[PDB]
Amino acid sequence: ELQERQAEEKRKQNAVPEWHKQSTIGKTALGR
Amino acid sequence: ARARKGALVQCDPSIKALILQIDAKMSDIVLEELDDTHLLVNPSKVEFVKHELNRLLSKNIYNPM
């Protein structure tokens, strides 16, 4: 189970951010 | 109770400042400041500022030859 957990953590470490998943043009512009 | 004909311009701070600069050069452009995102402009100058402003913005964008 630990190795499976480590593999899951390894996959998470490699996952790209959310903003890369979808084109964030329609959403409100970044800022404070 | 007082009405004043004009053109309501909605834009962003960056465009707002550009309109002010054009208004500084030509006084009649802006008739009154409403808010940080709304301006009152002369209807006659609308057709001229739109085309000239694009030329000014062309400097900020690099068109290769």
Place this chain on the structure above:
Amino acid sequence: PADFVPDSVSGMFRSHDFSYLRLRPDHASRPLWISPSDGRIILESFSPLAEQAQDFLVTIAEPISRPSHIHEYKITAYSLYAAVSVGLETDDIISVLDRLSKVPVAESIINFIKGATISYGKVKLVIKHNRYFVETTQADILQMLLNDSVIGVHSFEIANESVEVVKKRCQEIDYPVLEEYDFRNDHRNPDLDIDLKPSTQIRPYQEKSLSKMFGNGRARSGIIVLPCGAGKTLVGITAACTIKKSVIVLCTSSVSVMQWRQQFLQWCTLQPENCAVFTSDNKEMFQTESGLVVSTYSMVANTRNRSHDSQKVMDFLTGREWGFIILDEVHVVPAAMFRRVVSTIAAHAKLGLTATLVREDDKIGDLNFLIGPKLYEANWMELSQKGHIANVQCAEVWCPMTAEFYQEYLRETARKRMLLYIMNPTKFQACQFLIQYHERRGDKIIVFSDNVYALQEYALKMGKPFIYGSTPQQERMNILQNFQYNDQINTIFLSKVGDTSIDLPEATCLIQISSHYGSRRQEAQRLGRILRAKRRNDEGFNAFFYSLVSKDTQEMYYSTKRQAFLVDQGYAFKVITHLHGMENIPNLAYASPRERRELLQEVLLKNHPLIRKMY
């Protein structure tokens, strides 16, 4: 174009319609389209004979754009001049071109290939006892070279300094000069017994580059271009190991020179006794018959003020007749003064190593008669998909300019305008959120900034180390080692000094705040820091490159102008108009108007021997 009726839509193509020619019956197999006017070459990468042309085209035609499916090459005089050097005649080029072309080759194209593919291989420049002799294999050349307005079996002397003049003159005249070294039969120069250790693993593209150079058997002078981090250093090691003669290496940095020696030692069997490092720190030279001196252009190109300690070494370098010179980052040699070295120093063969062979001025083409033609170039995406280099999720973040600062942008001058829109508060907030988000992801981040003032302000505000010109070598080395091996320092703040030739195998993420206007080369060099990441083969690995730029500023002019080279390679930038989850971060810099106003003013304000006792 005979008896070809124009089409109704032929006016859309201004003297560019190529429908007048006919298509061969074997079009389905032949992958090549040839432009009869501009020489453009469209290549099918999804049809047979694609691989057989992917290498031939690179030799005779420079690559304009090579995207996934359809590659774009172009035939030019320089491209042909590069192919003719490596044992290629007009017949070979025409035969292969026709055999692979869907459409017949026009007469104009045939004429172009014939003219430039016959010049190479009639005049040779040789060196003997530090004396330059322009040796020719036939006596007829004497009536040409000796009678030339510029110049001055038969062999005649020529001024060492005038090499840069005659070589350019040779370009104008029919016959250009070729620098071939028969190191096998050269016994006068002391030999060096060095070889690559068994642990070495020459990658397939490295072998192809060497084959294009040693195909005939005689070393040719020229330039080799490989992607950043591809191993250009190892390329010089292999050439030294096979030549087995005294060699000198010039590298454009102090840290990088330290990198070359360590790499030399690790990859080949060069004994330490035969290796000497000519740098500012130590100035002792090898006394063995054959050795290696690794220096920089500033130590070989400087002419006015050389130190007494550094003056003896310069005489040591000049006195001996070197057999090979390795010019790392050959994109700096065609400068105003660096070109002087090629004429002063004596060497029978010259090699150029650079990841980027482009520059703002037109002097790049001068490399043909300075060091020689371009032998080989390697694709970027091809190595990315094969696991040789990491994949990158290139991104471009648009940070709107704050209202307060933008007001001064209009009135302010160009010189001060740069600082105004580079330090807008919004960029500070985005950088802090990205750093925190990526740090928890276990990613080593690099933040580039050409402006030193911004670097210090960002560094001090976030309490992170920064590096630039004034920092001593000892301190930066400690910083680099700590960042490399110490988990506490996960992010750093690089500057123009670290723009190229520094290896960070642990780096995976890359950020850039400021930039040196429109230079497309600096863009590629900076990206190279993360292209050599440690885990570039694990499943789903994708490096990240963020480019924060102020909207409605001159940065868009510079951004789209300094990123036109990566697009040609194949890289695609993703536009990030909004960064998800940026507002929920607890604290952001310059969140209140009071801080913004304070920063605005702070940045705006920036612009008788006995009498000796008396005295």
